[PDB]
């Protein structure tokens, strides 16, 4: 059994609808719903948590004055069940603010650390869905990375646009998004070198890649 956190950006920028027929928020929610439906119908034993960042309210164990704001734990580390699909397609609404994705990553790591205590897993995994529009602080990032390594948590990033060599003409990414892309690459290379950079995907590939990974003895 895997332990997986779906760490979903629901910030205001995700609502802006200008490619295709669906906003980044709608695309990401659709992927999440399809993934959870597959897991339920297949009676998978993987446990799946859901953390939202960019939510108007705050609900997480680390939240205090000016810390880990606008991050909400929507689903704890449990088996997905039929009843959750309804719960997801009702309490996943777009937020009106932005939040710090490294704060959201820490909340997700803390969730895994507490809720995997005393149990055996094939892997511990965090999958981030975001357009990287929101500012973030790199304070103590080196400790975040150290702890990801120590706990043997792997990371995957899913973005609504390509960033690889075939990405083609420019997509009008903001400087903040370009900074977010660069920091994602630094994090993934810190964790697994060139192979980690390969774990940055688009929304279009997310449903299928969420299941694929390299086995590492724990």
């Amino acid at each position: 059994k895997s332990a997986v956190v779906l760490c979903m950006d629901v910030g205001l920028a995700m609502s802006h609808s200008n490619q295709g027929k669906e906003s980044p928020f709608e695309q990401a929610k659709k992927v999440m719903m399809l993934f959870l439906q597959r897991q339920v119908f297949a009676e998978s034993k993987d446990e799946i948590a859901v953390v939202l960042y960019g939510t108007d309210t705050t609900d997480n164990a680390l939240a205090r004055e000016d810390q880990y704001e606008n991050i909400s734990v929507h689903r704890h580390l449990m088996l997905p069940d039929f009843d959750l699909l309804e719960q997801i397609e009702n309490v996943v609404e777009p937020g009106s603010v932005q939040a710090d994705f490294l704060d959201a990553l820490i909340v997700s790591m803390d969730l895994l650390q507490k809720e995997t205590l005393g149990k055996k897993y094939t892997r511990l995994h965090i999958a981030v869905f975001s357009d990287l529009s929101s500012p973030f602080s790199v304070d103590q990032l080196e400790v975040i990375i150290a702890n990801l390594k120590k706990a043997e948590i792997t990371l995957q990033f899913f973005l609504p646009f390509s960033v690889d060599e075939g990405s083609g003409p420019g997509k009008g990414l903001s400087d903040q998004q370009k900074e977010g892309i660069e920091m994602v690459r630094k994090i993934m290379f810190s964790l697994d070198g060139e192979e980690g950079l390969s774990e940055v995907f688009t929304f279009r590939d997310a449903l299928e890649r969420l299941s694929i990974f390299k086995k590492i003895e724990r």
């Binding site: 164990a61 680390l62 205090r64 810390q67 880990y68 710090d100 490294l102 704060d103 820490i106 790591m109 803390d110 650390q113 602080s137 790199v138 304070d139 103590q140 400790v143 975040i144 702890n147």
Partner: peptide, 13 residues
Amino acid sequence: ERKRILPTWMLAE
């Protein structure tokens, strides 16, 4: 840079 406070378990030696 905005300072964050990490949970104690992340600061353990």
